[PDB]
Each structure stands twice: as C-alpha cells, then as structure tokens.
C-alpha cells in the first residue's frame, strides 16, 4: 500500500553476473542494516564463472557494492590413499544467500566434487557447498554435508541408496532463530531431495581449511526413501521455518517438493527430526506447487500461516481452455493441535506466462495496522511482460483478495524483476519495513522504501 514507487534505490553488479539472483538484509553487530547480494555468474580468477557475493551498505543513492570475498581456488587433498577434489567452476556461488546475526551464508549449489582411488572414482558430481562469513571479524568457514568418499561401484551394488552425490546443497537455505542453518538439497538421494541442518557455531568450530572431508557431529540430515512418490520430487527446492505444532521450544521445517508424486508437487511441514506433521498436495500437475514457500502470521492471531506458490498454474478459462498464470495458496493455521485444512484463499495471476507466485516475501506489517502483509512476484507479468510485484495486506480473516499496490519493473524486458524478494526489515530506520527486489536479468537490485500511509 505505502511503498514508495517514485524514489527508488538501485544497486548494480557486473554485467552478466546475475547480481540480484538472491538477496537478504544483513545487520552487523551494531544493528546497522546492509544488503547482501548473490551474483552466481560473477567471474573468478581464471576468467571463468564461479559466482560471487556483495555486501551493499545502505545508501539512498545506491550504486556499486564491495565484494564479500571467498576462496575460489579448486582444492586437492591426497589422504587415506585417496584424492579429494573440489571444482568451483560454474558453481554458482551466490545462487542463495541468507543472513543470521552477524553471519552471512552464501551457497554454491553446483560446486562439483570427486574422489579418486587408483582407477576408480566417486564420480564428479554437484554436491554443492555453502560459504559462511563473519564480515566484521573476517572469519570464514564452509559446510558441504553431501561430500563423500564412497567409490561409484558401491552405489551401483546398493542400488544408489543414500546417494548424496548430486545434492546441490544450498539450492535453498534458511536459518532458525536459534542459529541452525537448514539447507535444501533437491538432488539428494538420487533427486528425491534432502535437508541438511547444522548449527552455525558448530560449522565454524569444526571447519579447518584444506580438510575437505570433516565431521560436523551436531548435523542432522533427512532420510532416503523407496516410495516412488518421492522420486524426482526435488524435496528441498524451497525451505522455510516456523511454529506449527504449538510447542514453542521446537522449530518446524517447511519444505517445498514441486515435482513430488509425478509432478503433482507438494509442501511438507516437519519437526526438527524430519518427521512429517502435515503434507499439502499440489492442485495441478506441472504447476510447480512448492516452488516457493513463505511463513508469516497474516491474520494477527499469533499463529504462523503458510503461503505456497505454484507459478506455472494454468487457470481455467472460456471454451475449455487453460492459461498459465500462476497461483498462490494461503493456509491459515488452526487453533490448537489440528490439521491445516483447505486453502483459505487462492490468488491467481492475470498475465499469461507471468509466473505469479514465483517468489513470496513476508513484508511484516507494512501499513502498520496490526496485520502482517506479503508481496508476491510475477517476474514476467504486467501488461508489458517486464515483471510485477503485488502487495497483499493482512486482515482478520487472512489476506485481502485484491492487491493494495502493484510495483511495475523499472528495468528492461528480461530482467526477471521479482525473481528474488525480501522484506520485513526497516533499512532506513524510519519505522516502516521496506522491500528489496532482485532483477538478476538486469544485474540490479531495487530498494522500495515504505512511507507513512497516505
């Protein structure tokens, strides 16, 4: 409603770097808010794409940002009569970024890995990896829970059970308030998908450079399965956390599986032991239900609600025809121990191929009326197809069915404006939560400042 679309702030990265593919707000040890920006195609040392991360100080004028430096060199360790190998070429460092406390977690989902032993090998595969930084101190650490040293022949004998070689850990990411990093790995267990969790403090204390393969004893991984419903489900394409079991001491995980059960798609709510508490099934095959998940209490009852995006949903129209527009589903959490029922509200896109629901950002309480609000992205929507972000306000019964405000992309065609979103943080300290919008196709980030309601 009250985001300012006149005076924006623009941050920009190098051409072709996909600057803005992922972003988050970052507060330093003094509470000063900055913007961490992932640029997964930034050039490295060998003039090759490896990705990169930028930490943008808040300025009304925006501009260029300094780099958050990470080691981009391939590593090799000859240990235990084996050869361990990391390959960072085209790893996509910055394909996801998230901030917690004064720590930044930037992940390279397509970092490859291999283990040689005489003439055998583990196979060169994208296990993925995440890089952790404490910018104020310069501390660095890594986390790559899907690296293994099992040779390829063994996986074939055991029918590729517990095969984490293609995890792409860090494809999605989230950090609990207690500081537990949760990684989505949609390629884990031969493309079933898995989740990897470990405390940030233990990642730092257990990591040493050059080891490549080390134990994080406090880590916890989800489980493989033989049920074909999960095969090729990309469980962990998207991840989020919240409180859904009524026990404030436990933190529940929200996991998107957009190709679950032969591309029907699903979203699941689990406890921290990966035991399933609820499952939301997709409405329409190939709609990619679960592409994005958001957790926020929208109706002001204190109970977290669930928003699921299906950006490829095809709406029914006249003369038995379908139109791909995308759809967002709102599930209100019921009072006490009860199952999440049918959706409380369906928001459906308008522009053909606009992909409404590709990203869903909690905004906090934007207009300061006591109800939290959301922004939904349609990165190829709007009458021109350049992209739109739509604000929906909370209310006592959930969300308004019509948007309070629509943000048209200020970038050219193909910018993918809205592909990444982040809100609920007051970056200019004016008492109103603001919105940052990534447009990786234009290698830029737009900052929308919230203003007093008019």
């Amino acid at each position, epitope marked *: 409603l009250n985001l300012d679309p006149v005076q924006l702030t623009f941050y920009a990265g190098p051409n072709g770097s996909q600057f803005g593919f992922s972003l988050d707000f970052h507060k330093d040890s003094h509470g000063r808010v900055a913007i961490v920006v992932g640029a997964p195609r930034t050039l490295g040392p060998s003039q090759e794409e490896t990705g990169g991360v930028f930490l943008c100080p808040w300025r009304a004028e925006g501009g260029q940002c300094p780099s958050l430096l990470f080691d981009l060199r391939d590593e090799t360790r000859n*240990v*235990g009569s084996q050869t361990l190998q990391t390959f960072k070429a085209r790893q996509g460092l910055g394909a996801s970024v998230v901030s917690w406390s004064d720590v930044i977690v930037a992940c390279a989902p397509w970092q490859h890995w291999n283990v040689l032993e005489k003439t055998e090998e583990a196979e060169k595969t994208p296990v993925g990896s995440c890089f952790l930084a404490q910018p104020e101190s310069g501390r660095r650490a890594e986390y790559s829970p899907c690296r293994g040293n099992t040779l390829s022949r*063994i996986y074939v004998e055991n029918d590729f059970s517990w095969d984490k070689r293609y995890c792409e850990a860090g494809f999605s990411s989230v950090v609990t308030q207690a500081g537990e990093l949760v990684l989505g790995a949609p390629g884990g267990y031969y493309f079933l998908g898995l989740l990897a969790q470990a405390p940030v403090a233990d990642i730092f204390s257990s990591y040493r450079p*050059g*080891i490549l*393969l080390w*134990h994080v004893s406090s880590q916890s991984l989800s489980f493989d399965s033989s049920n074909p419903e999960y095969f090729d489900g990309y469980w962990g394409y998207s991840v989020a956390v919240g409180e859904f079991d009524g026990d404030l001491n436990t933190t529940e995980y929200v996991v998107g599986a957009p190709t679950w059960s032969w591309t029907l798609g699903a979203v699941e709510i689990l406890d921290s032991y990966y035991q399933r508490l609820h499952r939301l099934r997709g409405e329409q095959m190939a709609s990619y239900f679960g592409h994005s998940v958001a957790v926020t209490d929208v109706n002001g009852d204190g109970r977290h609600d669930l928003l699921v995006g299906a950006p490829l949903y095809m709406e029914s129209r006249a003369d038995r025809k379908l139109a791909e527009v995308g759809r967002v589903y709102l599930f209100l959490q019921p009072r006490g121990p009860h199952a999440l029922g049918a959706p409380s509200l369906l928001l459906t896109g308008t522009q053909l191929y606009g992909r409404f629901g590709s990203a869903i950002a909690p905004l906090g309480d934007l207009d300061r009326d006591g109800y939290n609000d959301i922004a939904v992205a349609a990165p190829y929507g709007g009458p021109s197809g350049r992209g739109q972000v739509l604000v929906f306000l909370g209310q006592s019964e959930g969300l308004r069915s019509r948007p309070s405000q629509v943000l048209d992309s200020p970038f050219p065609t193909g910018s993918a404006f809205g592909f990444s979103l982040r809100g609920a943080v007051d970056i200019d300290d004016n008492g109103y939560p603001d919105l940052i919008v990534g447009a990786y196709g234009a290698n830029q980030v737009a900052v929308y400042r919230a203003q007093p309601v008019v």
Partner: antibody
Amino acid sequence: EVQLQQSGAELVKPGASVKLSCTASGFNIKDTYVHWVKQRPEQGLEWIGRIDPANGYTKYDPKFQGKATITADTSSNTAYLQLSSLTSEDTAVYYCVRPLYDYYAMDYWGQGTSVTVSS
Amino acid sequence: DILMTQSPSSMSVSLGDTVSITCHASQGISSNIGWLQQKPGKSFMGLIYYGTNLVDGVPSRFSGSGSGADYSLTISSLDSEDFADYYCVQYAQLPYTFGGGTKLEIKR
C-alpha cells in the same frame, strides 16, 4: 562427551581366539571411522585396520590379514576386534580410535585392552 | 608402506623449556600427519591433526609445523604434565604408520 570404553583385559591361550569390544559413549558409533591399533614396548605402535560401522566395510594392514577381523553392531553402539590363532607375539595392548573432525585423523582413543597369550 | 622416522628417541629437559620433536617420512605426505601424547601408564590423547590443527582442549603451548616430508611438534614452556611419550602418525596412505616415539624426561 566423546568416550571410547573398551572391554577388560583378556587372558587366553595360544591357538585360541578372542573378541575385543569398543563401545561408544556420548555419540553414535556410526558417525565416523573406527580404527584398531596395536602397541608393544619394542615394536611400538602398529595400525591394524578400520571399519565404517554405517556399512561394515573394512580396511586392513596386509600384516594382520587373517588374524584380525573387525566388525561393528550399531545396535549396541559397539565395534569389535576379533583375533584368531593367537600367538605370543599377539600379546599387546589394543586401542580403538576415531577422528575428531578430519575424516582420516586419529584423535580420540579408548583406554586400551590388555591381551596376554600364554600356556 | 610409508616409514615414519621420529627423532629424537628421548630428551632430558626442564620445566619452562621450549623443545621440538621432529618426524621424517619416506615420502611427501602433505601435512596429513597427527601428533599423539601418552602419559605414563595411561591411554593416548590427540594433540595435532592435519599438521597444524590443535585438537579441542589442547593448550596453545603445543604447536605443529612442517610440510612435504618433514614435520615438527613444539612445546613452548614445558609443564609438569608434558613429560610423557609422544608419537607421530601419517594418514596420507593406507596403511597408517606411526613414528618410533619420543619420551620427554626430567633433567637433573
């Protein structure tokens, strides 16, 4: 806290067999590699082999191929070292070892099991 | 197998001294070396892994260094508890092999 609690001292005869145990305390035995090391006052320290209790795969020094048999039971959280066709030279102290962080390291050690082979 | 020649076999030193134990391999092992301590009539405690990294709980007066095939364990300002046996172990190749050992003894 990580602790490796081994079985008590064994007193056996030559030609017989013995099976030592190494129980994990404060952690899951399935987490890391578990090695077995032999110590004698003259010959010093010698590496017998290792086991991954998650799957049972083992590696051995070719010197101990035949006498040493390493196994593990994730249920009882225990790893074992079986010695067969015992000889006076098998009289030694045996330690079970696991790493701290590095997959291939040798950081945590049990208190050791004393073995004496005699008629 | 990789031969681990550890030197010296023993040394007579006093409290507060800065001593250094060395370990030479028969081939390069690229810091894939650990250092161990065995107090008199007791089990083993890990000191160093991967050449330089202190095991959790080990005092900072211990330190490891070296590269290629030559490594060292150094103890700055010896404590009364530091008088014990010390061994190096390589894990660059299976089978793992240990150094001969080094016994720190009280000088008088």
